[PDB]
Design a protein around this ligand. Structure first.
Ligand SMILES: CC(C)CCC[C@@H](C)[C@H]1CC[C@H]2[C@@H]3CC=C4C[C@@H](O)CC[C@]4(C)[C@H]3CC[C@]12C
Ligand SMILES: CC(C)CCC[C@@H](C)[C@H]1CC[C@H]2[C@@H]3CC=C4C[C@@H](O)CC[C@]4(C)[C@H]3CC[C@]12C
Length: 137
C-alpha cells in the first residue's frame, strides 16, 4: 500500500496550480455540453410523456415477481399441482404486465432514440425471453 502511495502522489506532488481538486474541477467541468430536449411535443397523441412518477409505484411491482421467484421454494423435493399452476399464472400475468408497460412507454417515446438507453434494450430482451418461455410451453 505504501508503494501505491509513493507511485501515485509523485505524479503531481508539486501542484504549481490552484489545487488538485480545484484544478481537476476547472479542467474537467468546462467541457460541458447541455442537452436541448429529448421529448417531442406532439401533444395531440403523446399524453404518455408527461406521465411520470408511476414507475416509483411499479418499482414495487419489480419486487412482487421476485417473491414469485421464491414461491418455488414450496416445490422442495415435491410439488402441489394447484400451487404450481398458480405460480405459472402469476408468471404469465407479470410478463404480460411488463410487456404492456414497455409497449405503452415505447409506443410514443421516439423509437428512433429508444435504442440509446441500454436499459430499454435489456427490458426488450427480458420481455422477448418471457414471450419465448410462454410460447414454448
Ligand atoms: C414435506 C416437505 C416437502 C415440506 C413441505 C412444506 C414446505 C414445502 C414449505 C412449508 C413452509 C415453507 C416456507 C415458509 C416461509 C418461507 C420464507 C420465504 O421468505 C421463502 C420461502 C419459505 C422458506 C417457505 C418455503 C417452503 C416451505 C418450507
Ligand atoms: C392439496 C392441499 C394440501 C392444498 C395444497 C395447496 C395449498 C397449500 C396452496 C395452493 C395455492 C396457495 C395460495 C396461492 C397464493 C397465495 C397468495 C399469497 O399472497 C398468500 C398465500 C396464498 C393464499 C397461498 C396459500 C397456500 C395455497 C392455498
Amino acid at each position: 500500500v505504501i508503494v501505491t502511495f509513493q507511485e501515485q502522489g509523485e505524479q503531481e506532488y508539486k501542484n504549481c496550480e490552484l489545487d488538485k481538486n480545484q484544478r481537476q474541477c476547472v479542467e474537467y467541468a468546462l467541457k460541458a455540453r447541455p442537452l436541448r430536449r429529448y421529448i417531442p411535443k406532439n401533444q395531440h397523441q403523446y399524453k404518455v410523456w408527461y406521465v411520470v412518477n408511476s414507475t416509483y409505484f411499479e418499482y414495487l411491482m419489480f419486487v412482487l415477481i421476485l417473491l414469485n421467484t421464491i414461491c418455488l421454494a414450496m416445490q422442495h423435493y415435491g410439488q402441489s399441482c394447484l400451487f404450481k399452476i398458480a405460480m405459472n399464472i402469476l408468471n404469465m400475468l407479470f410478463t404480460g404486465l411488463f410487456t404492456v408497460e414497455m409497449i405503452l412507454k415505447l409506443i410514443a417515446f421516439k423509437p428512433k432514440h429508444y435504442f440509446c438507453d441500454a436499459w430499454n434494450t435489456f427490458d426488450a430482451l427480458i420481455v422477448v425471453g418471457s414471450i419465448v418461455d410462454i410460447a414454448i410451453t
